[PDB]
Amino acid sequence: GSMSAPLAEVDPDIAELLAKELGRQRDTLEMIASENFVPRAVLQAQGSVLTNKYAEGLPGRRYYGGCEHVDVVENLARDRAKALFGAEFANVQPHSGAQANAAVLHALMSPGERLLGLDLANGGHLTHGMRLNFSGKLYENGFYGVDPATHLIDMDAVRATALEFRPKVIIAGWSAYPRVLDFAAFRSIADEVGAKLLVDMAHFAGLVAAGLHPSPVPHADVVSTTVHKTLGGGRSGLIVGKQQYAKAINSAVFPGQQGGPLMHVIAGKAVALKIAATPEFADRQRRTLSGARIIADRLMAPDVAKAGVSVVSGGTDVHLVLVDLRDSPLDGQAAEDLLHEVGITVNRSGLRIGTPALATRGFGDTEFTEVADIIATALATGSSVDVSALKDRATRLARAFPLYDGLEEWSLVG
Amino acid sequence: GSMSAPLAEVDPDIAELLAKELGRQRDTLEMIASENFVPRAVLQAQGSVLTNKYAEGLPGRRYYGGCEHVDVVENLARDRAKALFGAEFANVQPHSGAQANAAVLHALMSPGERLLGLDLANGGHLTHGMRLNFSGKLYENGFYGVDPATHLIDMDAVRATALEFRPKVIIAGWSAYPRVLDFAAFRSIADEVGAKLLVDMAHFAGLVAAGLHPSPVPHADVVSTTVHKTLGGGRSGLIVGKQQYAKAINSAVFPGQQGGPLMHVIAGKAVALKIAATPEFADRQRRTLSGARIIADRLMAPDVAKAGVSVVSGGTDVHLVLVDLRDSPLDGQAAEDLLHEVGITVNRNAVPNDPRPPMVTSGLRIGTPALATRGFGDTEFTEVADIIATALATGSSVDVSALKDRATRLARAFPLYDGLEEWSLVGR
Ligand SMILES: [Mg+2]
């Protein structure tokens, strides 16, 4: 019967589609700033029989019996998260980054109260106040932005807005910003007006883990994150913070927002948190940051500047480069389509270019120099662009750094 | 590099705990009614490289490049759900049963508006209006229950409550009820008072798929479910319903409630929906139902009655049995602990007008889906029923050793996941 039959026998169309997606990941150059590649050991945990266990509640205080082994798993994930980030408390049950943020706002505020965050047009996430999301539907929203001249967040301007609006919760965090936030200034402003401070570090958490971006943990009431993105793990969420919020946050995740947690995915969170403390992971983060600096420099060279293309803030200190196309012949969709022709996946008069996934695959400075030159030539040279010559150079790079070499022979366990 | 190193090398403590949990599943008899066992093909989908893809939006309308293959995967899951259940639209993105219900309420009502559902004390779920869940925090709540004599939902009483309370949304659905809901009566009441009708079929979806429980789909505006529980798939949610509600429900899932979907888990949903249309799966549901009737019949016998034990509603028509213990020496927690000693996993459950506190109770909920998946039929269910009845009826003379030996004999005769240690991530 079908309980022990391979996927190839049970569902031939899904088996073929898994093979096609693996091929696409191997053949293309992935430069979406929010994406990465999980290690073999995380695939194994996500494919485990822990999916079968119902574990509503917390370790040692569950609805049902038989949780002895999954309770040790959840405690390894909590205790590794506290140690890696230097936090007082952790909850490792959120299903996603969005579900982590819904639980934090449930714990710290009530419907109708005031929420202050970074504007969508200026680099914020949809969970920081967008009108159709829970963050906009339930709460009264105010926003801060970036200085129009420097393109940096001006903390004197944030201060004046907070004193006027008097928010209950202030969010620091972003989906598209190219520099380092001042967490000590955010703490000072929240204290003045009696607000709680949430930092949403989803994009930059792996930089924090390796010691290459300043930590928000000393300064924040609560910190939310994805375990995917720069942290390099399986698709899910996580919360850490000060001890005084432990009961508020636990009760908001369950039974506030969720039912049963995904215990196979929590096992993978413990694995990713162990990898994130290693010297190998720290070097990978350094190759990420050096690649982003190499691309930003190449796009500020005379040929690109003359075509009307500019780099937002004049550089980067993080894992991505933000590009403004409004004075060039290209719009965002046209630039995205042209890069697809030469084998590169990015996202959109703006364009965002990221380096985490290529660093994980093994690219260093020589390789990022070649990738930057391919992009610059496409954006600068207009009608005279040789798509075919640029595609062959991209496929040469991909072929030289194999992805998931040997996956076709790997076991579920052992 | 650690990118290609096995789990046993990278994290020996976690590898060891995976092997201990597999052994616990093999050695016990699982009878929690919300539990089941996924097939090999679903383990392989959930362990796939599809975890790496960002895919916010819907097929053909995404916010990221490179989604050509994951768009085909999502459309196979949507099309198989519509065909299996006879529904006009499907959304296959919800992360869980709770997340499916949060999106439905976001689409159909506004904060402060009125919600009517089955009480927790009478077998409802916490997402049907419990005070400290979203369903109680955001909305004004009213409840219906079961009759104190018959233990059934009385639709004349549900109608009277709906006429007085005038809800915006009525929920029909349960976590612990032993009989068949009257969906045509719920539609009539909703139409009378101008309410929308949500059916939450999480517990009984696999019975509906096999044609062995009447379908809510012709009668409901929207239907929510888990893909785990009787449907037999990986841990996740699903929504199906009338085309009238498609645009609002899609917008409520994203950007209303969620961000990126879990594409590896959605591949596994497509696999579980294909299995659920097969004759093999229909036979498994027939064995689930026949096994539960055998357990109820054995408990309704002179030895068990004389010990102070009865069956709620005097029987069952679904995948579970509700036991009433209040005239016996055992409270619900005590009975749950005794059965664990003899190798069987169940959970405590509140009875009608229960005299004990809600965290202790005077009852049990006993389920058959997980053991039917493992291969049990009528012969095996007759033996487990006798083990349970003997434990509950013999008082201080119970022989735990003799009963535990009978349970482990059944576990060894029906191996679970035999050969898993040799199976590959991809291929055969
Ligand atoms: Mg309305």
Swiss-Prot record, chain A:
<feature type="modified residue" description="N6-(pyridoxal phosphate)lysine">
    <location>
        <position position="229"/>
    </location>
</feature>
<dbReference type="GO" id="GO:0005737">
    <property type="term" value="C:cytoplasm"/>
</dbReference>
<keyword id="KW-0663">Pyridoxal phosphate</keyword>
<dbReference type="Pfam" id="PF00464">
    <property type="entry name" value="SHMT"/>
</dbReference>
<dbReference type="GO" id="GO:0004372">
    <property type="term" value="F:glycine hydroxymethyltransferase activity"/>
</dbReference>
<dbReference type="GO" id="GO:0046653">
    <property type="term" value="P:tetrahydrofolate metabolic process"/>
</dbReference>
<dbReference type="InterPro" id="IPR015424">
    <property type="entry name" value="PyrdxlP-dep_Trfase"/>
</dbReference>
<protein>
    <recommendedName>
        <fullName>Serine hydroxymethyltransferase 1</fullName>
        <ecNumber>2.1.2.1</ecNumber>
    </recommendedName>
</protein>
<dbReference type="GO" id="GO:0009274">
    <property type="term" value="C:peptidoglycan-based cell wall"/>
</dbReference>
<dbReference type="GO" id="GO:0005829">
    <property type="term" value="C:cytosol"/>
</dbReference>
<dbReference type="InterPro" id="IPR019798">
    <property type="entry name" value="Ser_HO-MeTrfase_PLP_BS"/>
</dbReference>
<feature type="site" description="Plays an important role in substrate specificity">
    <location>
        <position position="228"/>
    </location>
</feature>
<keyword id="KW-0554">One-carbon metabolism</keyword>
<keyword id="KW-0963">Cytoplasm</keyword>
<comment type="function">
    <text>Catalyzes the reversible interconversion of serine and glycine with tetrahydrofolate (THF) serving as the one-carbon carrier. This reaction serves as the major source of one-carbon groups required for the biosynthesis of purines, thymidylate, methionine, and other important biomolecules. Also exhibits THF-independent aldolase activity toward beta-hydroxyamino acids, producing glycine and aldehydes, via a retro-aldol mechanism. Thus, is able to catalyze the cleavage of L-allo-threonine.</text>
</comment>
<dbReference type="GO" id="GO:0006563">
    <property type="term" value="P:L-serine metabolic process"/>
</dbReference>
<dbReference type="InterPro" id="IPR015421">
    <property type="entry name" value="PyrdxlP-dep_Trfase_major"/>
</dbReference>
<dbReference type="GO" id="GO:0006544">
    <property type="term" value="P:glycine metabolic process"/>
</dbReference>
<dbReference type="GO" id="GO:0005886">
    <property type="term" value="C:plasma membrane"/>
</dbReference>
<comment type="pathway">
    <text>Amino-acid biosynthesis; glycine biosynthesis; glycine from L-serine: step 1/1.</text>
</comment>
<dbReference type="GO" id="GO:0019264">
    <property type="term" value="P:glycine biosynthetic process from serine"/>
</dbReference>
<dbReference type="GO" id="GO:0042803">
    <property type="term" value="F:protein homodimerization activity"/>
</dbReference>
<feature type="binding site">
    <location>
        <begin position="124"/>
        <end position="126"/>
    </location>
    <ligand>
        <name>(6S)-5,6,7,8-tetrahydrofolate</name>
    </ligand>
</feature>
<comment type="subunit">
    <text>Homodimer.</text>
</comment>
<feature type="binding site">
    <location>
        <position position="120"/>
    </location>
    <ligand>
        <name>(6S)-5,6,7,8-tetrahydrofolate</name>
    </ligand>
</feature>
<keyword id="KW-0808">Transferase</keyword>
<comment type="similarity">
    <text>Belongs to the SHMT family.</text>
</comment>
<dbReference type="GO" id="GO:0035999">
    <property type="term" value="P:tetrahydrofolate interconversion"/>
</dbReference>
<dbReference type="InterPro" id="IPR039429">
    <property type="entry name" value="SHMT-like_dom"/>
</dbReference>
<dbReference type="GO" id="GO:0042783">
    <property type="term" value="P:symbiont-mediated evasion of host immune response"/>
</dbReference>
<comment type="pathway">
    <text>One-carbon metabolism; tetrahydrofolate interconversion.</text>
</comment>
<dbReference type="InterPro" id="IPR049943">
    <property type="entry name" value="Ser_HO-MeTrfase-like"/>
</dbReference>
<dbReference type="InterPro" id="IPR015422">
    <property type="entry name" value="PyrdxlP-dep_Trfase_small"/>
</dbReference>
<dbReference type="InterPro" id="IPR001085">
    <property type="entry name" value="Ser_HO-MeTrfase"/>
</dbReference>
<dbReference type="GO" id="GO:0030170">
    <property type="term" value="F:pyridoxal phosphate binding"/>
</dbReference>
<keyword id="KW-0028">Amino-acid biosynthesis</keyword>
